[PDB]
Write a protein that binds this ligand. Sequence first.
Ligand SMILES: Nc1ncnc2c1ncn2[C@@H]1O[C@H](COP(=O)(O)OP(=O)(O)OP(=O)(O)O)[C@@H](O)[C@H]1O
Ligand SMILES: Nc1ncnc2c1ncn2[C@@H]1O[C@H](COP(=O)(O)OP(=O)(O)OP(=O)(O)O)[C@@H](O)[C@H]1O
Ligand SMILES: Nc1ncnc2c1ncn2[C@@H]1O[C@H](COP(=O)(O)OP(=O)(O)OP(=O)(O)O)[C@@H](O)[C@H]1O
Ligand SMILES: Nc1ncnc2c1ncn2[C@@H]1O[C@H](COP(=O)(O)OP(=O)(O)OP(=O)(O)O)[C@@H](O)[C@H]1O
Lengths: 166, 536, 411
Amino acid sequence: QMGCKHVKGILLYGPPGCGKTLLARQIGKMLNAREPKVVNGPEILNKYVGESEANIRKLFADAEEEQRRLGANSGLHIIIFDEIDAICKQRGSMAGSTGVHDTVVNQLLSKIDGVEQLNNILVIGMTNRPDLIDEALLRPGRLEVKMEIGLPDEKGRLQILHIHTA
Amino acid sequence: RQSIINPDWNFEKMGIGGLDKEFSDIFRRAFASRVFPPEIVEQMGCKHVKGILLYGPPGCGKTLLARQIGKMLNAREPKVVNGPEILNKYVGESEANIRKLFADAEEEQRRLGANSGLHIIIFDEIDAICKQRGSMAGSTGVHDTVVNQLLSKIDGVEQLNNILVIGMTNRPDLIDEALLRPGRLEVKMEIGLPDEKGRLQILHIHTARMRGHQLLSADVDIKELAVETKNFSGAELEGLVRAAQSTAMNRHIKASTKVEVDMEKAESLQVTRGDFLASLENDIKPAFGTNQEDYASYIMNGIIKWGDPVTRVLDDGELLVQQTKNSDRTPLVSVLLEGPPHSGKTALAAKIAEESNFPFIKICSPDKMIGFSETAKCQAMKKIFDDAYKSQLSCVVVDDIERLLDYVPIGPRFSNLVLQALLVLLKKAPPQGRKLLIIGTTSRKDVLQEMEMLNAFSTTIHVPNIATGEQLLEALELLGNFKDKERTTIAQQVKGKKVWIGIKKLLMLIEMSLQMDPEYRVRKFLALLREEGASP
Amino acid sequence: IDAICKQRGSMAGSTGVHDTVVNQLLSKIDGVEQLNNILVIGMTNRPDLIDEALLRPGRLEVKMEIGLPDEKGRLQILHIHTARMRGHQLLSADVDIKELAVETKNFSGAELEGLVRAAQSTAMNRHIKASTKVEVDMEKAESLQVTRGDFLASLENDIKPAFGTNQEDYASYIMNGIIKWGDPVTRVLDDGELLVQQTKNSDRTPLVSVLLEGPPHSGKTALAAKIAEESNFPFIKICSPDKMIGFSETAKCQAMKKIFDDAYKSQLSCVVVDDIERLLDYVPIGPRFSNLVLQALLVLLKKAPPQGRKLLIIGTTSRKDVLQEMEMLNAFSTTIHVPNIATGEQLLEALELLGNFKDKERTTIAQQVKGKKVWIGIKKLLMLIEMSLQMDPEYRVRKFLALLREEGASP
Ligand SMILES: Nc1ncnc2c1ncn2[C@@H]1O[C@H](COP(=O)(O)OP(=O)(O)OP(=O)(O)O)[C@@H](O)[C@H]1O
Ligand SMILES: Nc1ncnc2c1ncn2[C@@H]1O[C@H](COP(=O)(O)OP(=O)(O)OP(=O)(O)O)[C@@H](O)[C@H]1O
Ligand SMILES: Nc1ncnc2c1ncn2[C@@H]1O[C@H](COP(=O)(O)OP(=O)(O)OP(=O)(O)O)[C@@H](O)[C@H]1O
Ligand SMILES: Nc1ncnc2c1ncn2[C@@H]1O[C@H](COP(=O)(O)OP(=O)(O)OP(=O)(O)O)[C@@H](O)[C@H]1O
């Protein structure tokens, strides 16, 4: 009765060792949905023409099929991008990785939000260099919830020490 | 005989606001000849348009328009191409993909002739497969063959009259120049930020359903929200509404052990104006608007009136703002604020810009260009100035010019490229109908005069130091640190002398003096003040 | 034809398919076996890239270049693309085709056809009235007629040439028009007319140059633009420093070379080079500048176009002595001086033609100025007037006079 869509992405950034991968792992296994998909850094690149984009497109197929078949009764699908700064970077700045990186960025942008509408996905990204990411991927309707994980204070250190000596 | 438009199509049903003129132009130029009676159009002996291009900044509603156009026509199911979806690794397999899209249109044209329907094709992110021919030395050779095939298929020896192509891009300057001629993609449109009368429409469109079911409180006024949200794109208004709804819905869910919904209270769910205010404070931050963070960072300790000169500077600033906003014989005006070091001339420029009340305000500072070469500095300046030509009223502040040119008295040495760019950028007028104000600050007027740079600026304003004992006493009183017993002792010594000190240094002197013992502070303050010297 | 046929030394990330195709075409067109009943037609946009072995006589002999038409060709195309309308009495009688042919300069056939199509659509759209439901009238639909206003509106809004328009350029270079505040303006325009005539008529000196010099804020760019506009040549272009922000030496040289190469293609052309001291980066300290651009200018100022073609060049600057020290003042044929305002009568006439400080205020100003000499440029006078107008009605003449005094003088 409100006509509102669901948020479609999260981004986490901060210095090393402060608990970004742990939080994503724990969120992945808190939900009733099926197993999540994990991309371990730049593991989609391929030497042949038009193969990286196919690897990108292959991540969303199940979501599209379930959305078409069921509609508003579908489940939830999760994708996790680890070290996302190694793939998505500002378009038209670098040498384009020989025209490869621009195509990958365009494909990802087209798949996340395009003419065909999805409502059953959640994308999580984690990075150490937040300033190198494309500006068109961090807008509302896309990865729009940005969070910073920093050093803890005395209470946080006490909580961690209680956690690790139980 | 069947009408091309759907029987039940209605403009208000599309759900688009703030783009009335764009849709009117598109409809007139694309669909005017497909609705007129066939015999007269045949007598005119004219052909149909077969192309549309949409460009603009992100989030302003390009894909939405294409989708609504696709669903407005009683035709087939439009084909959709998502980015570089056609490439293939086998030789000659990425061109068959291009050829395959027109195979139905060609067949129907051959069979039914002039009584065929309409076939739509949508290219999303077209600049991924249609860059100029020759650039981008991909050594595969698959990036020119595709462009040639597309060009030869859109308009070639064999003629088609039952197609329509829609393209959408963010970088219109990279498309091939042969694809945009009046025979291939004739209609070109720019989708930009809306104004108040468009923001109101967007907010109404996105709040109609909530209003229908009495889920919106009675103390929320849409007009005030439209006035308050300046230079917001279409996406950000929807994001704001979403954040407000989430804040409203989160009050009935307690989650310390196991997600548990109140359920009872959920009956009386209402969205209040406090949620909207909280969402504007924390969640949504625009890109072409103004942010309180910059003003808070550049005016740290506020502005105190320790004398008359402050008021003079502010009044002159106001006069220049008014001239910029209400004149057509001079669309571009610039001023230079100058004075001795530590006199506080950055905060004053920031205050003037803040009080101007223009929609777009930006500050170009060297704090964000550490280690840059002069080429990168020119690129950053050019980008900041280009972003300001897409607004009806703009203000730009250039801070610490001598740090921008990399100046050092020895030699002397500086950067010529940045100087020339800045000299050429102070006289380029904006597109007709737009206004721009520039405020530059510096502390070395003689150097700028020697560089023939005072002919570019229109006027100069002077920011002075504290020059009398009464002014120093008034500043101390307004700051409120030394009490009457100590203020009398200070006045005994300073009243019979002239002083020469800046506010930014007076604050430092006061905090240095405040660290000694309670009965030793006045002596140290006087010693520091005397040692500072005057040397006017 | 350039998609498949290209030089054999090419893409090295190749599987060997783009060379065997060229060899098979060469061997099939003209090989050991002989044919006498074939004809091959090829179309291309990049003739240079094609293989040289395919262009020798006996394989591809007749090479033809299709270019932009002239006024007569434009008239022919406009007549071809309106015959059907004219035959059925669908075209109004106030439409003058010759005026269109004159106005549409640098257009090609496709752009002219698009102009006609847009004009037709603007007329068809006056009957289709639909804000919430499509519905054609069909009552007035039998009285459809395309008028002159439709053509004018479509020319202003929709269709734009791809070879430069100069409408917006002339809009932005001459922003406040030209006002005859004195005698010097007429002299400058007369000298420009004489130079244009000499370029047009004389055949023994195909190349002519001139330099417009004067103190800053005198209005030297507007006068040059006006002279170029009144020249009425087929080709006119302005080379400005404000379209090369951030460029290096090589990029600037390339841009000027491209502009001059385009100029050499036509039959008689005019070119404007404004702000020479900003084109080559001059700064008094040092001094510093770019030698590459200076050498390019000195070389291009004396190069004659191919026989039977004529070129005029107009350069503007505000520092004559600097150009003299580089020995550039000797590369120009002659010079023209653009002076400032020097007398009270000229200032009063300028105020009269500008339309400000009417009646008694003018009398007060005249009383205060006539007993002195003045030294002010035209461009700064507008700034002073707009600055003075922001005061209250009782403090407008006083502020204007104070600013004028503070301006100073230095003949
Ligand atoms: N907030 C925390 N509470 C408890 N343990 C933590 C916390 N943050 C980090 N750790 C510990 O740190 C380990 C590794 O940290 P983690 O991999 O989450 O960091 P990271 O930010 O991904 O590091 P990197 O930037 O190198 O990828 C975890 O397995 C956990 O033991
Ligand atoms: N004029 C508008 N009226 C109503 N909603 C709008 C408008 N413009 C944008 N929106 C909202 O923005 C959402 C996303 O915008 P959209 O995808 O159309 O932008 P875009 O221009 O394609 O952006 P991108 O540059 O990323 O492609 C739409 O679903 C809609 O909710
Ligand atoms: N009346 C006032 N006018 C200006 N600044 C004031 C006033 N009252 C307090 N201040 C504070 O004084 C400080 C002035 O420092 P600011 O950086 O603006 O000076 P500056 O001359 O630009 O410095 P520098 O010459 O070292 O670059 C700021 O913290 C400002 O908030
Ligand atoms: N009689 C006139 N002659 C020339 N320009 C005039 C005249 N009357 C009004 N103008 C206007 O005055 C302006 C002249 O400024 P212009 O930019 O041509 O000067 P400039 O000498 O190039 O200045 P700068 O030294 O800054 O380069 C134009 O807007 C022009 O339309």
